[PDB]
Scaffold this motif. Structure first.
Motif, PDB file in Angstrom:
ATOM      1  N   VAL A  28       0.851  -1.225   0.000  1.00  0.00           N
ATOM      2  CA  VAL A  28       0.000   0.000   0.000  1.00  0.00           C
ATOM      3  C   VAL A  28       0.874   1.259   0.000  1.00  0.00           C
ATOM      4  O   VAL A  28       0.466   2.306  -0.460  1.00  0.00           O
ATOM      5  CB  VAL A  28      -0.822  -0.085   1.289  1.00  0.00           C
ATOM      6  N   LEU A  29       2.071   1.169   0.515  1.00  0.00           N
ATOM      7  CA  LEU A  29       2.958   2.368   0.543  1.00  0.00           C
ATOM      8  C   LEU A  29       3.977   2.309  -0.599  1.00  0.00           C
ATOM      9  O   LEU A  29       5.036   2.902  -0.531  1.00  0.00           O
ATOM     10  CB  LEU A  29       3.665   2.305   1.897  1.00  0.00           C
ATOM     11  N   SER A  30       3.666   1.605  -1.651  1.00  0.00           N
ATOM     12  CA  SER A  30       4.620   1.516  -2.794  1.00  0.00           C
ATOM     13  C   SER A  30       3.853   1.346  -4.110  1.00  0.00           C
ATOM     14  O   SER A  30       4.247   0.598  -4.981  1.00  0.00           O
ATOM     15  CB  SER A  30       5.480   0.288  -2.498  1.00  0.00           C
ATOM     16  N   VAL A  31       2.758   2.045  -4.255  1.00  0.00           N
ATOM     17  CA  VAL A  31       1.957   1.943  -5.507  1.00  0.00           C
ATOM     18  C   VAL A  31       1.678   3.343  -6.057  1.00  0.00           C
ATOM     19  O   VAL A  31       0.877   3.523  -6.953  1.00  0.00           O
ATOM     20  CB  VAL A  31       0.660   1.260  -5.081  1.00  0.00           C
ATOM     21  N   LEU A  32       2.341   4.334  -5.523  1.00  0.00           N
ATOM     22  CA  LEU A  32       2.129   5.727  -6.006  1.00  0.00           C
ATOM     23  C   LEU A  32       2.916   5.952  -7.296  1.00  0.00           C
ATOM     24  O   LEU A  32       2.494   6.669  -8.178  1.00  0.00           O
ATOM     25  CB  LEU A  32       2.675   6.618  -4.887  1.00  0.00           C
ATOM     26  N   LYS A  33       4.063   5.343  -7.410  1.00  0.00           N
ATOM     27  CA  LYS A  33       4.883   5.526  -8.641  1.00  0.00           C
ATOM     28  C   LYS A  33       4.570   4.426  -9.659  1.00  0.00           C
ATOM     29  O   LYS A  33       5.352   4.145 -10.545  1.00  0.00           O
ATOM     30  CB  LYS A  33       6.331   5.432  -8.161  1.00  0.00           C
TER      31      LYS A  33
END
Length: 36
Positions: A28-33
């Motif tokens: 959840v903390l690694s899907v922005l890029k």
């Protein structure tokens, strides 16, 4: 000063460290890029 014990149970994890307040870490903390 009253810090003898004051219950260690409530004093050990509720601190809310490791950014673990509810349950969100990695993924959840690694899907922005992924496309933004």
């Amino acid at each position: 000063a009253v810090d003898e014990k004051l219950r260690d149970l409530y004093s050990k994890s509720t601190a809310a460290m490791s950014t673990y307040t509810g349950i969100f870490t990695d993924q959840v903390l690694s899907v922005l890029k992924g496309e933004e």
